[PDB]
Design an enzyme around this catalytic site. Structure first.
Site: not given
Ligand code: CL
Ligand code: MG
Ligand code: MG
Ligand code: MG
Ligand code: MG
Lengths: 226, 204, 196, 244, 250, 243, 241, 195, 231
Positions: C1-2, C128-130
């Site tokens: 996720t971004s 999110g991770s991004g």
């Protein structure tokens, strides 16, 4: 297990292999993985076999009662919502991984469901140990506006990829076609590319080969008159 | 430690021409210690036969449970339960204990009294139905049984020929399993006669 | 996720990638992470897909019942309902949600709800991770009261970089624009945003 | 509040009687007569269906005689729907006992259990009692062939021959006259049918107005058989005994 | 609050009568006539669609209801009581049978479950009895075709043919003269239409009559093909046109 | 007959007599009023001085809910306190889940449904109060009045208690003579007058006046009691009008 | 004679508390009407504000249950709001559980089942209201389904409720006898509202101002109520032909 | 506790049970009777976890005594053993299971036959000519397999039992302080006071 | 009449008869007086005996160091309500480190009594209470009725013949409110007040019960020879 679902022009098709395993052992060579939720809503299950069958029948039962209560033909989104809320509540412990497809008054639908309750929408989907082999075929040959004949061909080709390349999958291809304005056609053993060859020898024994200690008639009848 | 292999034992079932056969060993043990050579694992409720392998306390409990349920069935329905219907009842009953299951491997065998069609079925501990045309196997020597049945079996065997096939399948499978043996029983089932035969086998 | 949401002159825009992942396998390359809980109150989801779907369905139910009794809910109210579910069930949930909405009285608003279940009202939010890889870029390039076209470019460029560096992110860039004029969906394909 | 509308179903009268029990017994006195006779080699259960029709499907019909297990049966007099509630409870109790002890339930233990359930509805809960009287015919290896009756009070007693329902006073006098201890089943069959024939409120006793059952050790060797008679079989036994 | 009515509202009177059950049967007597006839190869159930207003769409009110694919039901008495009983009957067919045995219950046992629900409303605390009598027709493999009546008390009886409600006494006499054990389904439908005409005052056509059968399996109504053992429902509701066609040969 | 002995029983008219008897207790109580002004609401109540031994200004009758709603009632005082306690729970749960303070129409239905619930069963008694309440929310000022039956509507002006007819007539004059509206400070003065005029139905004992208000400009949309100089000014205005 | 106080059978097989609840239905002295167009469903109701101290904007017997379903009530306002709150809760729960909007006829059945329970269980009284549900259903099209204190419900081509329901009913019957169709053959909802108001004027024999009426309209995907000025525009068009 | 043995001969059932009670380091008692009379012609010996053994045995005893009074009848050994099995089968899926193994020796007065039932804590029941729990069978079964006959007298059974105990005393590491021996026959239950 | 069978029934004139009958139990009870100045608050209570062998029933109950009441009516009901006050005073101290305001104590008693007047099965409380206390806003006196009505007063009396004491306090209002910093004179005024309610009997050493609370005075009860000084 390999299971796929493919959308086409006027409906949706689902398919599956017919192998069920206990570790490395094949328990049943001609297993039925295509389950009916309602006449025109069918799903295919991977994971714990009892869970996929049980969760399908529970929701299928409640869907039937809902259909009778509302005087309306069941919808795929209803089956989806009921399945996911049931699976979320059990926090993944019910190991049911499903591809849910069908036609209803709203149109044709294709969803998938992971055991912990997550859902997704798509034109082509695959689940199970052979899902990567199947998805490779789907990603190579899928296009928009497929015909019925093309979708059946693509779905069975994707299952074959699982049959030949995944050790968790094997034997035969089962298919179910759900077209708008038609009866759903369940094609059991649509392909049979794994018949065993004749054996070299007959293993029928001579009568009297086995040593016997005692013989007796078993009374299966009820208590008799007179 | 593993509940399904504390006591040991096996069951096998087969179909033939207008007949079915179901067979089991007679051993009950406490791991390495042999305790009983008269522990039969096949039961019957009317004309429907049920074999059960696994944890022996659950084997006894489930027999008592299905006797209970098939007796109430008969009183209400005014007829004996059929193999197809009983199979669904076993599946339902096992799944209700989904997260605290009976550690067993049941096997159903029988002939439908109205259609005359031979029927067999198998289950995992949690209720999943395996309805094979040919044969069903269960127990601590299920691998061995799969090997025997796959080579020895052919379709449409006459009752007396089917007896030899299933007997040899059980015997030779049991002799390759430490926790199975100590005697064996074979049931040959026709539409209105059932014969029960005890087999002579090695007692180690 | 971004995922991200950005307030601008005419309202607010939500942005997201389309990648869902079970390990290193992309289980869905065309996912829709922009979710509607009310006509002009949407959210971006990150974390467990099961959890964030379950939460969003419950919030949609709550706001539908709110609307039937009290009329259109505020974005603050929607954020509070999200918070209540995330805070009270913090032990059993893995969810990071950004709530974005348009009122006529309050205009565009963004609330971010991280893992703990706290609420933070912000001019813009990333998650999110991004998102880790674009904290620097976004802080340097964000301005208040941007135009629609400028905000689309800011989100497109930001998520482009997030996708470039984060293996968990990818696919298409989806966007949802929330203004007085209505609700507009946008999509941007790899061949477009990779050359930026 | 709600007290205003409470009938108080579980109270004594000034004379020390239970109102509802007494009134339930009054209801049962209008039900079709059921008779049980115990012999040395078996038990007979005979019962009259209430004013029937030609369009009633008799061969699939059951209102009087019910199977509790393979060894025990009951004849019903009163509200059929009330009886079926208790019958299903009794069937479960029998199976519970069989599962627990791996032996068929002794007849009296089953009878006591059902009778205790009836008693509870007279002492607590504020609900109406069951408007049912049972005749229990059964066999076990302790006491052999046994006949019991229970009524809405929850009281039960054992009998050599007994009737419940309509005209019990007349029926009991006729049974007391012709019953002997060394009697056999075939003789008891005749007595039961003759007694119903004389006490009936109908013009004549025919096969379509009867339900009949025997419990015999006339089952091949040391075991017991229950026989719920078919319509044609009731017609034959009526000709044999010379009633039609 | 709390339901403080934990006591029985149906009790025995000095004469041994259960007043509330008798009064419920009186409500059934006032109800519109419905009937059922059993043939060798089927069963028919029928009733009048007594429309409360001509502005009302009487097709939206179903007096004849499917309980299972092979079992149907009709009533006389209080409509709302019937509607909730149909809901409960449909659910209990699943919860207490299909979810256990993997098949639909036989007619006699579903009737038994409905009867139990009606008995409990006659003894449980703070409730009145149901004000309906039901006629339930059905088929199953081992019992064949069958027809049952269920009353407010919970009592049920099997019938070759019968009628309940308004003109039941006259209708049952009419059925006694016409019924035999050699009737085909079409003959039974013909007799049903003849019998029902006597108790109907106004219009008598496919739009004012509701009629359903339990007969042959209908593979065309199954909704799917591919499973040989699944051959479709035996319950079928006749259309307005199908009724009118048989009213010309009347 | 007997239809009036139990709550929730319909009479052959289709009436609930127990609810109608609760209204009699309301009509027996002291006069209380409410006036909707330009940007808020004013509440006032008559407090009968039964004895010299009553401590002046101490036995407060008007009650606050949350920080923006005022409530006053006539009839059985304890029943009114019970209703306000429930209202405070309803307002707390609303603000807990939805963050924003409860809107007045939303709050009105919460009280309405609760009062209506006490007409559904014979195990409870209907409320022996009519409640006048309101305040300021995001959509402006709102004034409501709620009866024992659970019935409520929005009002321009409202009155209940023993002197309700007198008060209603005075309120109707204000509506006619001010179609453009009334200011908050004017409404406080007018409220004092109306209570003094309505005290003719309770003329035997002397009384104490109690006023409160919520106004967007005068109190920042918060409920406050009128005290000191502003209260005395309203008392003087009222005394001047009766003479 | 306690069989008249609670919902148990009288010796004639009647439920008097249910019958008396039907009488409470007319306590407000308000009449309502509903009709179907090609694309819409319209419901109109009389509005009476007898007190000058009342805020007329808060006086209403039409409710927005969901986005698609509207409900008009005939009966006292407390019971009306009780039924409204429940219907709103039921519609929302349905959408959450089954993933699609609750149909008008299904909501009617559900509320009718709830009403049936009050006629069988003693501790609960019937609600003294008649509920008319309207929508444009995605499967069945324009829909009118009406519920009463007995637990009865049915679909309608058109319907009327209140003290003077019979006059309105017969007026509507006569129109549909002429046209021989099940609806108002009109494209726009504005003209269907005009038909509804015109035929209420004819049946009751009274004229209406903008404040004397209350109107609700159901179209595909939304139900809404008209303002006083929207109704005024409707009244002007009626007078100009 | 430790060693419990059983043997069914022609006309009786003989149960032998050790006398020692050890609480870890020390032998607290050397005369403990690990048995309870359930009915006049039914005896149950037991071994397992401390406390649970006596608690379970006395609980079963109370229940059978209650049945005897209610019906004025002694349950058959088969019926008692089935009741006991069900209690243990119920117990094994409880919050805290009874860790108790039992032997049930009874004389059926109806069939005039002795009967021996072996039941472990899981609820595993078997009818046997001879049985044991724990490690007792590992030492004794080879002797019983050789010498046992179905037509043995009570005295011959006691002699075969002595040979079993001697082998236990030779090859077992633990000192179980001898055994208490009890006989169950048509006349009831009695203790052999010299063994 | 037909409307006094339970507390859940209004009469046709809107009265609650069960509550009115509970009020009647207070009028049968023995007289007790309450009065206060700006520094202190006093309770005076006439105790009632069964006969000459019996003790005199206690009338005053301590609820906290700064609060307590006197009773008239059903004594067990006073025990239930005083126990509830002790708990509520205690909850305030333990949770909030705060002495419970006398006015808030009245509100809690009102709400507890109200629930017993609107529900089926229950009954109203059959006792009246006079609560005195000294908190952050000075001295206070409350009167509790089991209808739920609680009232703050300078002085009052409840029980049989309480009207005589109530009139005396109404005359003396301006005098006794000014008795600041003199506990003995405030009690004297209370003893003189309760004397206006006596007939045939007079105040003896085991008849009289007095309680006081104030600025630097914990709630204390005086009985026996401790009240001889005031006889
Ligand atoms: Cl429902
Ligand atoms: Mg071996
Ligand atoms: Mg070996
Ligand atoms: Mg990437
Ligand atoms: Mg009721």
């Amino acid at each position: 297990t390999t299971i796929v679902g493919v959308k086409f022009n006027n409906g949706v098709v689902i398919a599956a292999d017919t192998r069920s395993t206990q570790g490395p052992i094949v328990a049943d060579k001609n297993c039925a993985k295509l389950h009916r939720i309602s006449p025109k809503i069918w799903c295919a299950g991977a994971g714990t076999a009892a869970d996929t069958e049980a969760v399908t029948q529970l929701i299928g039962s409640n869907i039937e009662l809902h259909s009778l209560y509302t005087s309306r033909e069941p919808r795929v989104v209803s089956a989806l919502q009921m399945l996911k809320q049931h699976l979320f509540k059990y926090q993944g412990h019910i190991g049911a991984y499903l591809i849910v497809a069908g036609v209803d008054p709203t149109g044709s639908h294709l969803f998938s469901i992971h055991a912990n309750g997550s859902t997704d929408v798509g034109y082509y989907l695959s689940l199970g140990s052979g899902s990567l082999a199947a998805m490779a075929v789907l990603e190579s040959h899928w296009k928009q506006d497929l015909t019925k004949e093309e979708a059946i061909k693509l779905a069975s080709d994707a299952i074959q990829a699982g049959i030949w390349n995944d050790l968790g999958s094997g034997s035969n291809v089962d298919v179910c076609v759900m077209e708008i304005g038609k009866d759903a056609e369940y094609l059991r053993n649509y392909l049979t590319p794994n018949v065993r060859e004749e054996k070299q020898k007959s293993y029928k024994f001579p009568r009297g080969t086995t040593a016997v200690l005692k013989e007796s008639i078993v009374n299966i009848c009820d208590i008799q008159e007179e | 430690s593993d509940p399904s292999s504390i006591n040991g034992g096996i069951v096998v079932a087969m179909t033939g021409k207008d007949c079915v056969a179901i067979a089991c060993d007679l051993r009950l043990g406490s791991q390495s210690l042999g305790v009983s050579n008269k522990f039969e694992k096949i039961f019957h409720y009317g004309h429907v036969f049920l074999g059960i392998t696994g944890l022996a306390t659950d084997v006894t409990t489930l027999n008592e449970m299905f006797r209970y349920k098939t007796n109430l069935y008969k009183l209400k329905e005014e007829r004996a339960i059929e193999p197809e219907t009983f199979t669904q009842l076993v599946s339902s009953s096992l799944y209700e204990r989904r997260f605290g299951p009976y550690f067993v491997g049941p096997v159903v065998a029988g002939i439908n009294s109205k259609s005359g069609k031979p029927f067999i079925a198998g289950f995992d501990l949690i209720g999943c139905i395996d309805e094979a045309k040919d044969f069903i196997v269960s127990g601590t020597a299920s691998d061995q049984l799969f090997g025997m049945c796959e080579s020895l079996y052919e379709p449409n065997l006459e009752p007396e020929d089917l007896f030899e096939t299933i007997s040899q399948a059980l015997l030779n499978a049991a002799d390759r399993d430490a926790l199975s043996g100590w005697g064996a029983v074979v049931y040959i089932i026709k539409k209105d006669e059932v014969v029960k035969r005890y087999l002579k086998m090695r007692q180690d | 996720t971004s995922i991200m949401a950005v307030t601008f002159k005419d309202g607010v825009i939500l942005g997201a990638d389309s990648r869902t992942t079970t390990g290193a396998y992309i289980a869905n390359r065309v996912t829709d992470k922009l979710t509607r809980v009310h006509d002009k109150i949407w959210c971006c989801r990150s974390g467990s897909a099961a959890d964030t779907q379950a939460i969003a369905d419950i919030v949609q139910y709550h706001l539908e019942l709110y609307t039937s009794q009290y009329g259109t809910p505020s974005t603050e109210t929607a954020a509070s309902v999200f918070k209540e579910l995330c805070y009270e069930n913090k032990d059993n949930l893995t969810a990071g949600i950004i709530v974005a909405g348009y009122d006529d009285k309050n205009k565009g608003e963004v609330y971010t709800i991280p893992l703990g279940g706290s609420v933070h009202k912000l001019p813009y939010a990333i998650a999110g991770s991004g998102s880790t890889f674009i904290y620097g870029y976004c802080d340097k390039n964000f301005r208040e009261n941007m135009s629609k076209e400028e905000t689309v470019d800011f989100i497109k460029h930001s998520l482009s970089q997030a996708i470039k560096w984060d293996g968990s992110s990818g696919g298409v860039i989806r966007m949802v624009v929330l203004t007085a004029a209505g609700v507009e969906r946008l999509i941007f394909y790899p061949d477009e945003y990779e050359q930026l | 509040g709600s007290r205003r509308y409470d009938s108080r179903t579980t109270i004594f009268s000034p004379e020390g009687r239970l109102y509802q029990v007494e009134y339930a017994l009054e209801s049962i006195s209008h039900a079709g007569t059921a008779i049980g006779i115990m012999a040395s080699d078996g038990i007979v259960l005979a019962a009259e269906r209430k004013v029937t029709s030609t369009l009633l499907e008799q061969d699939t019909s059951t209102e009087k005689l019910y199977k509790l297990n393979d060894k025990i049966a009951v004849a019903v007099a009163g509200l059929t729907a009330d009886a079926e509630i208790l019958i299903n409870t009794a069937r479960i109790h029998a199976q519970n006992y069989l599962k627990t002890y791996n032996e068929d339930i002794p007849v009296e233990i089953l009878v006591r259990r059902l009778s205790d359930i009836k008693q509870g509805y007279t002492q607590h809960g504020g609900l109406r009692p069951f408007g049912v009287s049972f005749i229990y015919a059964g066999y076990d290896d302790r006491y052999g062939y046994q006949l019991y009756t229970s009524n809405p009070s929850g009281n039960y007693t054992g009998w050599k021959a007994i009737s419940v329902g309509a005209n019990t006073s007349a029926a009991q006098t006729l049974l007391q006259m012709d019953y002997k201890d060394d009697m056999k089943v075939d003789d008891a069959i005749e007595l039961a049918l003759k007694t119903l024939s004389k006490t009936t409120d109908s013009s004549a006793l025919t096969y379509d107005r009867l339900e009949f059952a025997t419990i015999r050790k006339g089952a091949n060797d040391g075991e017991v058989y229950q026989k719920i008679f078919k319509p044609q079989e009731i017609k034959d036994i009526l000709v044999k005994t010379g009633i039609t | 609050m709390t339901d403080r009515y934990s006591f029985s509202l149906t009790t025995f009177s000095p004469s041994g009568k259960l007043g509330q059950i008798d009064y419920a049967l009186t409500a059934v007597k006032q109800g519109v006539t419905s009937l059922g006839i059993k043939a060798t190869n089927g069963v028919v159930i029928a009733t009048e669609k007594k429309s409360s207003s001509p502005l009302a769409m009487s097709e939206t009110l179903s007096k004849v209801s499917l309980l299972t694919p092979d079992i149907g039901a009709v009533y006389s008495g209080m409509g709302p009581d019937y509607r909730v009983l149909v809901d409960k009957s449909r659910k209990v067919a699943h919860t207490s049978y299909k979810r256990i045995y993997g098949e639909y219950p036989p007619t006699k046992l579903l009737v038994s479950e409905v009867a139990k629900i009606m008995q409990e409303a006659t003894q449980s605390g703070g409730v009145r009895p149901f004000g309906v009598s039901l006629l339930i027709a059905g088929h199953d493999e081992f019992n064949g075709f069958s027809l049952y009546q269920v009353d407010p008390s919970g009592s049920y009886f099997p019938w070759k043919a019968t009628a309940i409600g308004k003109g039941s006494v006259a209708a049952k006499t009419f059925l006694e003269k016409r019924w035999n054990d050699e009737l085909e389904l079409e003959d039974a439908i013909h007799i049903a239409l003849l019998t029902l005409k006597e108790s109907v005052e106004g219009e008598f056509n496919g739009d004012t009559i509701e009629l359903a059968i339990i007969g042959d399996e209908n593979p065309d109504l199954l909704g799917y093909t591919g499973i040989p053992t699944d051959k479709g429902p035996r319950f079928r509701k006749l259309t307005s046109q199908e009724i009118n066609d048989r009213l010309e040969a009347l | 007959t007997g239809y009036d002995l139990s709550n929730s029983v319909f009479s052959p008219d289709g009436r609930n007599f127990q609810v109608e008897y609760a209204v009699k207790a309301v009509e027996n109580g002291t006069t209380s009023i409410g006036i909707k002004c330009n940007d808020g609401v004013v509440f006032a109540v008559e407090k009968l001085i039964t004895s010299k031994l009553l401590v002046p200004q101490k036995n407060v009758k008007i009650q606050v809910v949350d920080r923006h709603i005022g409530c006053v009632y006539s009839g059985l005082i304890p029943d009114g306190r019970h209703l306000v306690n429930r209202g405070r729970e309803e307002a707390a749960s609303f603000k807990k889940l939805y963050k924003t303070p409860i809107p007045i129409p939303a709050f009105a239905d919460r009280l309405g449904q609760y009062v209506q619930a006490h007409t559904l069963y014979n195990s409870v008694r209907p409320f022996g109060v009519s409640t006048i309440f309101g305040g300021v929310d995001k959509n402006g000022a709102h004034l409501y009045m709620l009866e024992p039956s659970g019935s409520y509507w929005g009002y321009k002006g409202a009155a209940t208690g023993k002197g309700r007819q007198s008060a209603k007539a005075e309120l109707e004059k204000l509506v006619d003579h001010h179609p453009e509206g009334l200011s908050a400070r004017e409404a406080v003065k007018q409220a004092a007058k109306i209570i003094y005029l309505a005290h003719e139905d309770n003329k035997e004992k002397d009384f104490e006046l109690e006023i409160s208000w919520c106004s967007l400009s005068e109190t920042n949309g918060l409920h406050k009691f009128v005290k000191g100089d502003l209260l005395q000014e309203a008392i003087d205005f009222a005394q001047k009008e009766i003479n | 004679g306690y069989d008249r106080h609670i919902t148990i059978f009288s010796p004639e097989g009647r439920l008097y508390q249910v019958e008396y609840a039907f009488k409470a239905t007319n306590q407000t002295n308000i009449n309502s009407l509903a009709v179907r167009g090609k694309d819409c469903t319209v419901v109109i109701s009389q509005k009476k504000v007898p007190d000058k101290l009342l805020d007329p904007t808060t006086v209403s017997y039409i409710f927005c249950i969901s986005r698609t379903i509207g409900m008009v009530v005939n009966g006292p306002i407390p019971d009306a709001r009780n039924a409204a709150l429940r219907a709103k809760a039921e519609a929302a729960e349905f959408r959450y559980k089954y993933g699609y909007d609750m149909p008008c006829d299904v909501l009617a059945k559900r509320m009718a089942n709830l009403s049936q329970i009050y006629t069988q269980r003693a501790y609960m009284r019937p609600l003294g209201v008649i509920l008319t549900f309207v929508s444009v259903d995605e499967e069945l099209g324009p829909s009118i389904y009406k519920t009463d204190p007995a637990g009865y419900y049915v679909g309608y081509k058109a319907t009327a409720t209140g003290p003077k329901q019979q006059e309105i009913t017969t007026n509507l019957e006569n129109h549909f006898k002429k046209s021989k169709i099940d609806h108002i053959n009109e494209e726009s909802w504005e003209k269907v509202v005009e038909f509804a108001i015109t035929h209420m004027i004819d049946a009751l024999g009274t004229e209406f101002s903008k404040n004397d009426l209350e109107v609700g309209v159901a179209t595909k995907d939304k139900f809404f109520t008209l303002s006083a000025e929207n109704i005024e525009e409707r009244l002007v068009a009626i007078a100009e032909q | 506790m430790d060693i419990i043995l059983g043997i069914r001969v022609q006309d009786s059932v003989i149960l032998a049970s050790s006398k020692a009670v050890t609480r870890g380091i020390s032998v607290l008692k050397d005369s403990d009777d690990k048995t309870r009379q359930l009915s006049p012609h039914t005896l149950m010996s037991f071994a397992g976890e401390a406390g649970d053994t006596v608690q379970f045995a006395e609980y079963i005893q109370a229940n059978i005594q209650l049945y005897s009074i209610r019906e004025d009848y002694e349950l058959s050994p088969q019926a008692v053993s089935s009741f006991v099995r069900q209690e243990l089968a119920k117990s094994i899926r409880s919050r805290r299971p009874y860790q108790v193994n039992v032997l049930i020796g009874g004389y059926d007065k109806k069939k005039n036959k002795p009967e021996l039932y072996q039941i472990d804590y899981l609820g595993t029941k078997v009818e046997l000519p001879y049985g044991a729990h724990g490690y007792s069978g590992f030492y004794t079964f080879s002797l019983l397999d050789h010498h046992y006959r179905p037509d043995m007298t009570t005295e011959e059974g006691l002699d075969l039992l002595k040979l079993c105990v001697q082998e236990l005393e030779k090859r077992m590491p633990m000192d179980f302080k001898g055994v208490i021996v009890k006989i169950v026959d048509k006349d009831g239950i009695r203790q052999v006071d010299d063994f | 009449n037909n409307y006094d069978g339970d507390t859940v029934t209004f009469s046709p004139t809107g009265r609650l008869f069960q509550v009115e009958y509970a009020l009647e139990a207070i009028k049968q009870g023995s007289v007790t007086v309450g009065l206060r100045s700006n520094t202190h608050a006093v309770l005076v209570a006439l105790k009632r005996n069964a006969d000459e062998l019996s003790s005199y029933q206690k009338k005053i109950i301590k609820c906290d160091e700064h609060m307590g009441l006197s009773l008239a009516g059903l004594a067990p009901d006073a025990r239930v309500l005083s126990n509830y006050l002790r708990q509520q005073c205690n909850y305030s101290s333990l949770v909030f480190n705060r002495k419970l305001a006398v006015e808030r104590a009245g509100h809690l008693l009102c709400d507890k009594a109200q629930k017993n007047t609107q529900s089926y099965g229950g009954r109203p409380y059959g006792v009246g209470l006079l609560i005195i206390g000294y908190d952050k806003s000075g001295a206070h006196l409350l009167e509790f009725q089991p209808s739920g009505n609680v009232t703050e007063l300078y002085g009052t009396a409840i029980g049989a013949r309480s009207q005589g004491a109530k009139t005396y306090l109404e005359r003396t209002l301006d005098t006794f409110i000014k008795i600041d910093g003199n506990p003995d004179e405030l009690i004297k005024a209370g003893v003189e007040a309760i004397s206006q309610s006596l007939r045939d009997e007079s105040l003896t050493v085991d008849n009289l019960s007095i309680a006081i609370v104030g600025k630097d005075t914990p709630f204390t009860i005086y009985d026996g020879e401790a009240v001889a000084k005031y006889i």
